[PDB]
Amino acid sequence: ETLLGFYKQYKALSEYIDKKYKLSLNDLAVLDLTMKHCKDEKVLMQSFLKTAMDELDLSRTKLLVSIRRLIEKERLSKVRSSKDERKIYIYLNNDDISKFNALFEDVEQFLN
Amino acid sequence: KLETLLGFYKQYKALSEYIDKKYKLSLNDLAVLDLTMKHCKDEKVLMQSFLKTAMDELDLSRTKLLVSIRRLIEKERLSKVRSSKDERKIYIYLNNDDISKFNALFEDVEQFLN
C-alpha cells in the first residue's frame, strides 16, 4: 500500500514527460547523468556508455537510443574526432544546460 | 533526494523487467491485481463497479484497465463470471487458486525489492 503511492507518481511523471517533451524516464536518467560528466568539457562516447551502464543499469543499446534521442531533441550535443571517424564525443553546451535546468525544475515541481 | 529518486528509478525499472520476463505482466497489471485483492477476495464484483474504483484509485484510463483485467484473466490470475440474465453484465472475482497465485507473486515482488 506504500508501493502504489510510488507507482502512481512514477506513472504520472512518465506520462507528463512523454506528453510534454516526448522523452522517456530513461532519457531523463541519461540526461541527468550527462550533467555530471560533460557539463564543462566533452566526454568520449564509449566511455560514457560504460559509466552509464554501471550507474543506470541499462543495456548498451537502450543507452545509445536515449543518447541519440537527446541529441535529436537538441538537449545534448555531439562532436566527432577530426582524426578518427569512428570516435564520437558528447557534451552539453550552454543552450543544453539552460534546457536541462528548465526541464528538471519542471520535474521537481510536478513531483512537489 | 535526487539520489533517492534516481535510486528508486533503478529499483522500479529493475522490478518492471523482472516481472515482465518471469510473468509477462506489467506493473499496471500488478497494481490492478493488487486492487482486485481488496475488492473480490471473498465475493465477486461487477466490472463497472470495479473500473470506476480502479480508475480513481490507480489513475488509469478505462481502456488501460480493461487491457490489464483481460490480461490477468488470460494469464489465469483473475476469474470472470457473466450474468445469466443480462449478457452485457460481467463480474470478476478471485478464486482460491487465484489467491494462492496472488500470494506467491507478491511474496516474489516483496523479496525482489529487498
Swiss-Prot record, chain A:
GO terms for cellular component: cytoplasm. It holds the Pfam family Staph_reg_Sar_Rot. GO terms for molecular function: DNA binding. Its main location: cytoplasm. It comes from the Bacteria. The keyword Aminoacyl-tRNA synthetase does not apply. Gene3D superfamilies: Winged helix-like DNA-binding domain superfamily/Winged helix DNA-binding domain. The keyword Membrane does not apply. It is found in: Cytoplasm. Residues 49-72 bind DNA. Induction: Transcriptionally activated by MgrA. Expressed maximally during the stationary phase of growth. GO terms for biological process: regulation of DNA-templated transcription. Keywords: Cytoplasm, DNA-binding, Repressor, Transcription, Transcription regulation, Virulence. Belongs to the SarA family. Involved in the regulation of virulence genes. Acts as a repressor of the agr locus and consequently targets genes regulated by the agr system such as sspA, hla and hlb. Binds directly to the agr promoter region. NCBIfam families: Staph_reg_Sar (TIGR01889). This is HTH-type transcriptional regulator SarX. It comes from Staphylococcus aureus (strain NCTC 8325 / PS 47).
